[model samples]
Target: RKTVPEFLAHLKSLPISKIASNDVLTICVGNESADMDSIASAITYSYCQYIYNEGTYSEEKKKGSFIVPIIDIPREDLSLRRDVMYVLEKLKIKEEELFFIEDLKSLKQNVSQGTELNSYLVDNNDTPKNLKNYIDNVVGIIDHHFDLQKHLDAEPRIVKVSGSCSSLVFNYWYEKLQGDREVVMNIAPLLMGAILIDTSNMRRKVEESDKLAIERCQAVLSGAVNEVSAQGLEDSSEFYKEIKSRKNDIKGFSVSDILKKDYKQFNFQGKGHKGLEIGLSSIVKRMSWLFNEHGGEADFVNQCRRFQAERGLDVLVLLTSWRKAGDSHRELVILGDSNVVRELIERVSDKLQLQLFGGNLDGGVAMFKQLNVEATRKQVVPYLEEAYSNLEE
Candidate 1:
């Protein structure tokens, strides 16, 4: 989803040569913690499986079935609480019959946490979570974000890169539907919107390849834009209004409390925009109001102004969510910043009692630091830090 090259790199890694016709292929996305990139990637892969012809097997041996895309939502986000439910309703899928992956009891057997993407490669030495049902069924992996070598090792295919995985998947669809002008006209807009939201319109840590992919997607969907825009006009207006309403509701709370609410509200899979910017905007607007009411301490707007001016950076994003716990969120923030920004994070951590982790965006220094004097550089990186260290070597 991040970019086309990364997605293609992962796509080309799959071992399609070994796949037989009788295989009941299942495409599993990330945990419900997935964003739009995850959702679009899974759906796009499934579409690819359906339309593309692979291998030269005998007719008797070639059985084709649709790649069932399933979203694994945890129990806490279940009972129609997850945003995926909204998408499901839009898709006209029955929620009860939908495949649920988070329920441990539902799994036939628990696969070990570390699973290789390519069963044939034992020497690659990347150990990620193994898929319980996917050892035999999972034919590919499509993800955006940093590479997970171990996970790639377990699967036959690996499609990963920077930006959003959605861009990659959309590109494939745009290519596949080339002849079918109507189909291209219909799905192109959806894919374009997904890519736009995921990449923040190429504003995030995206490369040139990502921009090209987005442009291609936009070109494909151009024919449908007018119609799609007209249809979505009402919904779009209501969506922003809903966001503003939510912002107002959280405006009166303390910064810590507001952060907690926003964190708890994190939805991995589902409908609505999933950009970090949207969440940050909502949080900042509400926090600004709260600071004004109290007339004490630097107001949210002023602090953000100071945070940006003192840092002299593109944008300063602060996230506090119970869903990520302290360490993981801090790590993401660090990964998203430069060396100076990383230092700024640590400085703020010291002043506000928070933890900061990971290397700066600029390749200068690690700049990781502890908050409240008890934080550790180890806490800045997640479990994958060790693996990253190996990659660095």
Candidate 2:
């Protein structure tokens, strides 16, 4: 396997001229919600294109060349749109060029009742009339969720098993640059923010790779940007607040909001070695609030303890992704309540079973776990069986 620097150089060596000849449309969708990882990766890719892509670099063209529209769904925060607006301002991109998919007449009809959320709809599945036309045009798909067949056929899709897509993109860029200190440093700050936002400052679904990637990114960025500081972290929070406050400027959100919502899977103790996976999106801020309103963490542990009081939850895993300015996928694991901090692991592992990794609750996690196209089917089998057996019993 190539180290990051080698991989970056290799990617850098690719025929950019040829690649640019092909007009590419990029789309990233996962768990019905958006987060910093996916947002960061998409933005970074757009930013890196300047360095790698052979495109007309007029300020207008750069702004127009990249189109990352949010899929609308209900209960969506208008503030997220505001955050993206702020980032674009920072990047000096125009607001008019940014597109949101809900504008499509056909897609607007597919909205689910009440929630406006749809279960993952496959290509062959019946879709709204407007969406049918788009089924053929989706060029590159970027995501960090367990979607089996969607990406299997996407010709230029980039998927992985990490907590956030930003982490994977960081690794890809780091590898593609072949150790270009300046280039690596230029994007490291953004990637670090992505990682922090995706990992909830390193709290959810933490795998080994997440830790190493963040540390490495910080090292490279330290030379170019300021060393990671509390001030920087606070700035992110302030930015998030600014975006959250702008929750109504966006219009036509039902369809796009549902499409951009956040959902998650969880596991607890009472279910014998069993786990439960449910998906939902929340616009609320603060980790503790999420734990409480969405079924308190204490309730989760207590339910597990009921099944095995003595061994009660040797491990309780909670994975959640956020897309606001500081969006992240944070993992909080209670391991015998140990004081020792855990190391990061790749978000997803090749090994079918026995996949485990750890990291900070407020830090970032990998998107790898969510990108294994193969694992979705494999993991779902047991879930179906468990659901069926419960009904029979």
The TM-scores of all predictions, comma-separated, are 0.46, 0.44
lDDT of each: 0.38, 0.40
User: Residue-pair clashes per candidate, as listed?
Assistant: 33, 73
Scored by lDDT, model 1 comes in at: 0.38
* TM value for model 1: 0.46
Error of 1 at 128 (Å): 7.5
Q: Which residue runs of candidate 1 sit more than 4 Å off their true CA positions?
A: 1-25, 53-64, 75-97, 102-138, 151-158, 176-190, 224-393
Which predicted model would earn the best lDDT? 2
